[PDB]
Design a protein around this ligand. Structure first.
Ligand SMILES: Nc1ncnc2c1ncn2[C@@H]1O[C@H](COP(=O)(O)OP(=O)(O)O)[C@@H](O)[C@H]1O
Ligand SMILES: Nc1ncnc2c1ncn2[C@@H]1O[C@H](COP(=O)(O)OP(=O)(O)O)[C@@H](O)[C@H]1O
Lengths: 185, 239, 239
DNA sequence: TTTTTTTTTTTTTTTTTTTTTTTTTT
């Protein structure tokens, strides 16, 4: 797609997914960098009143969220962020997918499966949430693995549901996770 | 700035006509993704099973000498050749969930590995695992496993028992190693008792074999149609 | 806004008549809850004990060759067979709180694993843990256990001690190994010293075996009714 | 104060089978 080296079947499938996404007019992407929870609530309440009511939110790499009041203390910054996002989700009555990085603690552990502790900052996000689900793809660490093309979704907390370890297949050539109707886990 | 038709038209400026977008909706696109994902999952699993054999061992289950080794090229000379060949055919066909071992006994140069590899060539198309291997190479794997603490010989034996059709080669020799005995009985124990097949290749007689191969091993070998095919012929390559 | 009447009426609108609660009170609630708590804990600890050796290892118990192994498929030939079957039955019936072991001896093809597996099949449904296993497999598990530090031979030995009926197979072969002997005698030491039964399966005689199972272990096995029961027949699969 | 990430130095705790050639004296 970023080269133009594509064939008729591909041109077609692109036309199809495009002509699908245009007819619904669901998605609304904000390409602004250093937002605050104030602005997030504002934009979300804006898309809400006009277009019915939203159904889902995604927030990429939470830690970029700011609030300049608490710019001197970072942990409290993240705490305010998390409370704001939870309150938002409770306000508009939707979920809030909120990504977050992890710290380099699981590297000196020899297992490399992330635990609920290994969250990038403040540890409130391991408290304010109804659901955490980490990701683990063994072929990144292990080239000696017989478990490649396989990415497993290590749930790590769920207040109203079970813990687990879901299993899915990664094909990053087209940036998709798909279901793994394979052996058990 | 631009609308549905205008954008799609600016894009047909690239792509030629007679373009069936093939979905038109979401209810079908999700189903198509589901289908293709199950397909790619199956292919992925096949590839990783293969890699598991290449990692636990080396030497892809069939070797390039016995790779082009089906039933057809087995030149016919006599009636025992039919007694072996057609019996092998029905052994392949009746292999599914069958506790049916086999021992080809006979002199070298007689095509024992050949038919045992025709079997395996078929079972690769069936979608099963195979391995022709020499006990020397097995014990080499054991004694290399002793070195590294990343793989261990129980993991190795589990890899062996997890095989669909294992066969052993160059067994008739009277190597007296206690540690060879404890492995060669244990493997067939862990396979037969785990309700899986296996079949050896030898140059020896039943009683010649039965002092090296313990009574228990022959006992766990002789099941159903145990297939005591024997070659009492003259070597091929001298022709 | 709403009371017991209106609320339970709207509740019956969900769910039909004759749904009577069977509690009606505050004490029977907690009582039946504790009842189900202990009943759940039973199968819970059962699942723990049974998944130890299916999580770490495989096939913990009877293994699929000797699973379909009722007493009654046992073919009758002679008074030795009567002795074996009858004594096996009474050993099962007088099993509970009874320190009584068994050391079958004799050639293969006689029904050692068969009778041991019928025994263990029954003691499953009686609510007891069992494991038929090869000594080679135990030592393989040990030699794998040296790899990882998360587990330990101590852990596996205490697990075997936690088993109700530990049994051993193919012990007759004369491996003089120090680390084999320490395990084979330490296991019986731990079990019998903790007032727990077990039993073995071999081929040789008491004396020729006793250098392998020390006089200590043999005498510490021969309690109550040792049940030496011996088989001196031909192989079954020869028939 | 209490959280959090980052590098740097100290201690302490944990480890089996294998294969050979010998080479005697009968
Ligand atoms: N009947 C036959 N037809 C064709 N090739 C044969 C026949 N018998 C033996 N061969 C050839 O002889 C070789 C040796 O047979 P093989 O079973 O591989 O070794 P061994 O005889 O030691 O078991 C094979 O590579 C095969 O090509
Ligand atoms: N009394 C019997 N009746 C029927 N089958 C028997 C009898 N004894 C042994 N067998 C069969 O012989 C085989 C070997 O018996 P088993 O005790 O399991 O192993 P082993 O004979 O080596 O101890 C088994 O497949 C079993 O079904």
């Amino acid at each position: 797609i970023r080269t133009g080296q594509l064939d008729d079947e591909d041109w077609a499938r692109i036309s199809g997914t495009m002509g699908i996404l245009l007819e619904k007019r669901n998605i609304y992407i904000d390409d602004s960098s250093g937002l605050t929870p104030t602005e997030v609530r504002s934009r979300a309440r804006r898309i809400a009143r006009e277009h019915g009511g939203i159904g889902l939110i995604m927030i990429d790499y939470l830690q970029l969220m700011r609030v300049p009041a608490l710019s001197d203390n970072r942990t409290l910054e993240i705490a305010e962020i998390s409370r704001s996002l939870k309150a938002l989700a409770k306000e508009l009555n939707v979920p809030v997918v909120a990504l977050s990085q992890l710290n380099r603690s699981l590297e000196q552990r020899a297992d490399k499966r992330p635990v609920n502790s290994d969250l990038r900052e403040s540890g409130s996000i391991e408290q304010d949430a109804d659901l955490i689900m980490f990701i683990y793809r063994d072929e990144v660490y292990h080239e000696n693995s017989d478990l490649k093309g396989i990415a497993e979704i290590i749930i790590g907390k769920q207040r109203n549901g079970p813990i687990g370890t879901v299993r899915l297949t990664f094909n990053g050539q087209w940036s998709r996770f798909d279901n793994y109707a394979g052996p058990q886990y | 700035m631009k609308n549905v038709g205008d954008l799609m038209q600016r894009l047909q400026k690239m792509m030629p006509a007679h373009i069936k977008p093939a979905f038109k909706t979401g209810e079908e696109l999700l189903a198509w993704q589901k289908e293709q994902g199950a397909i790619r999952s199956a292919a992925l699993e096949r590839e990783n099973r293969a890699m598991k054999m290449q990692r636990t061992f080396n030497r892809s289950g069939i070797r390039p000498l016995h790779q082009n080794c089906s039933f057809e090229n087995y030149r016919v000379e006599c009636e025992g050749q039919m007694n072996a060949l057609s019996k092998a055919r029905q052994y392949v066909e009746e292999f599914d969930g069958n506790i049916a071992s086999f021992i080809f006994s006979g002199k070298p140069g007689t095509g024992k590995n050949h038919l045992a590899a025709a079997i395996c060539n078929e079972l690769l198309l069936r979608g099963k695992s195979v391995l022709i291997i020499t006990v020397a190479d097995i014990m080499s794997a054991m004694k290399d496993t002793f070195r590294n603490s990343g793989t261990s010989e129980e993991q190795l034996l589990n890899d062996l028992s997890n095989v669909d059709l294992l066969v052993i080669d160059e067994i008739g020799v009277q190597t007296e190693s206690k540690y060879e005995k404890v492995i060669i009985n244990q493997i067939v124990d862990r396979r037969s008792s785990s309700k899986r097949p296996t079949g050896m290749l030898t140059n020896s007689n039943m009683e010649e074999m039965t002092k090296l191969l313990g009574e228990r091993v022959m006992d766990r070998m002789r099941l159903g149609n145990s297939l005591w095919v024997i070659f009492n012929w003259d070597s091929y390559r001298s022709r």
